[PDB]
Scaffold this active site. Structure first.
Site, PDB file in Angstrom:
ATOM      1  N   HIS A  80       0.830  -1.208   0.000  1.00  0.00           N
ATOM      2  CA  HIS A  80       0.000   0.000   0.000  1.00  0.00           C
ATOM      3  C   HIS A  80       0.867   1.262   0.000  1.00  0.00           C
ATOM      4  O   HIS A  80       0.823   2.069   0.924  1.00  0.00           O
ATOM      5  CB  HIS A  80      -1.012  -0.016   1.146  1.00  0.00           C
ATOM      6  N   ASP A 229      -8.854   0.195  -7.699  1.00  0.00           N
ATOM      7  CA  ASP A 229      -8.106  -0.278  -6.546  1.00  0.00           C
ATOM      8  C   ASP A 229      -7.569  -1.695  -6.721  1.00  0.00           C
ATOM      9  O   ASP A 229      -6.472  -2.004  -6.252  1.00  0.00           O
ATOM     10  CB  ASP A 229      -8.957  -0.184  -5.276  1.00  0.00           C
ATOM     11  N   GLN A 281      -6.753 -17.089  -3.852  1.00  0.00           N
ATOM     12  CA  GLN A 281      -6.914 -16.187  -4.983  1.00  0.00           C
ATOM     13  C   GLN A 281      -8.125 -16.554  -5.851  1.00  0.00           C
ATOM     14  O   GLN A 281      -8.890 -15.675  -6.243  1.00  0.00           O
ATOM     15  CB  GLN A 281      -5.612 -16.104  -5.786  1.00  0.00           C
TER      16      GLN A 281
HETATM   17  O1  LIG Z   1      -5.765 -12.011  -1.491  1.00  0.00           O
HETATM   18  N1  LIG Z   1      -6.806 -11.404  -1.292  1.00  0.00           N
HETATM   19  O2  LIG Z   1      -7.767 -12.034  -0.875  1.00  0.00           O
HETATM   20  C1  LIG Z   1      -6.912 -10.079  -1.513  1.00  0.00           C
HETATM   21  C2  LIG Z   1      -7.410  -9.239  -0.514  1.00  0.00           C
HETATM   22  C3  LIG Z   1      -7.532  -7.864  -0.716  1.00  0.00           C
HETATM   23  C4  LIG Z   1      -7.153  -7.305  -1.934  1.00  0.00           C
HETATM   24  C5  LIG Z   1      -6.655  -8.135  -2.934  1.00  0.00           C
HETATM   25  C6  LIG Z   1      -6.276  -7.581  -4.158  1.00  0.00           C
HETATM   26  C7  LIG Z   1      -5.776  -8.409  -5.163  1.00  0.00           C
HETATM   27  C8  LIG Z   1      -5.668  -9.778  -4.921  1.00  0.00           C
HETATM   28  N2  LIG Z   1      -6.045 -10.302  -3.726  1.00  0.00           N
HETATM   29  C9  LIG Z   1      -6.532  -9.516  -2.735  1.00  0.00           C
HETATM   30 NI    NI Z   2      -5.786   0.709  -2.373  1.00  0.00          NI
HETATM   31 NI    NI Z   3      -7.087   1.276   1.007  1.00  0.00          NI
END
Ligand SMILES: O=[N+]([O-])c1cccc2cccnc12
Ligand code: NI
Ligand code: NI
Length: 330
Positions: A80, A229, A281
């Site tokens: 981030h 995002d 994933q």
């Molecule tokens: O791994 N995730 O569950 C996961 C959680 C939050 C954001 C993500 C964004 C891209 C890929 N995976 C994500």
């Molecule tokens: Ni973000």
């Molecule tokens: Ni955020």
């Protein structure tokens, strides 16, 4: 703990920046990858702002002060961070340029600024962590904790000496753009996405969806913020793969912090559970990503290439599970 200010030397350098000819045609595409162009990142955003909002939309002196101070208020965390901010900003751009006349001048500038500021001062800790271990931020911002802080960080940057890109708007327009940004930033809290998507899907199917209805706009914008995002999942596989390493690096360091404080974390944040990643994933793609890109395509048909790429990356994670991976190098 306060707010950083960029050096006179840093914003002065950015004013001089010209985007190399080759990239001008590449930047326009949904699948584009900022990664191989680190020194160009701040200058890429300026470029994007000028194409979408016009070269005189912002006082360039103040714009450069804003961008570089925004850079300095992102932290050296694995995901981030500044790279993420610019990546998100670019996906918004591609959406905007592809759907240009559906969004006003005021919404375009504010959304591009919102994307660049949306993870300001992120510590590499999730909302879950802060609320479980009752961190002061959780007591101040009971819901959408980091998001509210991100927005609060943005307003703090605007309020700096010569940093306020928005001053030239009327008092009525100034109010509106801070609200556009606030909603955009708060909409990046993934907790809200599930309700938002379900609401939009149902609005679309029953055909009650109406972009002249403010509440509807807020929601479409919200899904756009979600789509941007998560755009790591809409790049080409090699890029999608490398970005996950960064996403998980940060998850595991938080899981490492929880073990010290005597609490065992969720599998996703457990660096001794890396084997569950491909299945994790898959579930995240079916639960969050695919539906987000499906509804957005229905509402905004030119955004389709994002869905196609996401479907492709999901096919690649399915290949991984059957044991058909390729080197990746790291
Ligand atoms: O791994 N995730 O569950 C996961 C959680 C939050 C954001 C993500 C964004 C891209 C890929 N995976 C994500
Ligand atoms: Ni973000
Ligand atoms: Ni955020």
């Amino acid at each position: 703990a306060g707010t950083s200010i960029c050096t006179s030397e840093e914003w002065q350098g950015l004013m001089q920046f010209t985007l190399p000819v080759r990239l001008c045609k590449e930047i326009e595409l949904f699948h584009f990858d900022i990664g191989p162009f680190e020194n160009m990142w701040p200058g890429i955003f300026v470029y994007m702002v000028h194409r979408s909002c016009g070269t005189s939309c912002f006082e360039l002196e103040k714009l450069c002060r804003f961008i570089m101070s925004v850079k300095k208020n992102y932290r050296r965390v694995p995901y981030h961070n500044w790279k993420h901010a610019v990546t998100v900003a670019h996906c918004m751009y591609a959406i905007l340029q592809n759907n240009h006349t559906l969004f006003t001048d005021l919404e375009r500038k504010g959304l591009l600024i919102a994307c660049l500021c949306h993870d300001l001062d992120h510590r590499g800790f999730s909302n879950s962590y802060l609320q479980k271990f009752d961190h002061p931020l959780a007591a101040l911002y009971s819901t959408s904790t980091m998001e509210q802080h991100h927005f609060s960080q943005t307003v703090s940057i605007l309020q700096l000496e010569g940093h306020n890109i928005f001053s030239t708007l009327s008092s009525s327009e100034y109010e509106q753009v801070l609200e556009i940004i606030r909603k955009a930033i708060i909409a990046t809290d993934l907790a809200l996405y599930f309700g938002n998507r379900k609401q939009l899907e149902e609005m679309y199917q029953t055909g009650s969806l109406n972009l002249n209805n403010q509440s509807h706009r807020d929601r479409v914008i919200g899904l756009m913020m979600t789509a941007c995002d998560l755009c790591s999942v809409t790049k080409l596989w090699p890029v999608t793969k490398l970005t996950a390493n960064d996403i998980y690096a940060e998850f595991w360091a938080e899981g490492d912090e929880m073990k010290k404080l005597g609490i065992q974390p969720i599998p996703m944040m457990d660096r001794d559970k890396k084997d569950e990643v491909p299945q994790g994933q898959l579930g995240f793609y079916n639960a969050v990503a695919i539906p987000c890109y499906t509804t957005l395509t229905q509402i905004l048909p030119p955004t389709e290439p994002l869905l196609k790429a996401c479907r492709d990356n999901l096919s690649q994670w399915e290949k991984v599970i059957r044991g058909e991976e390729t080197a990746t190098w790291i």
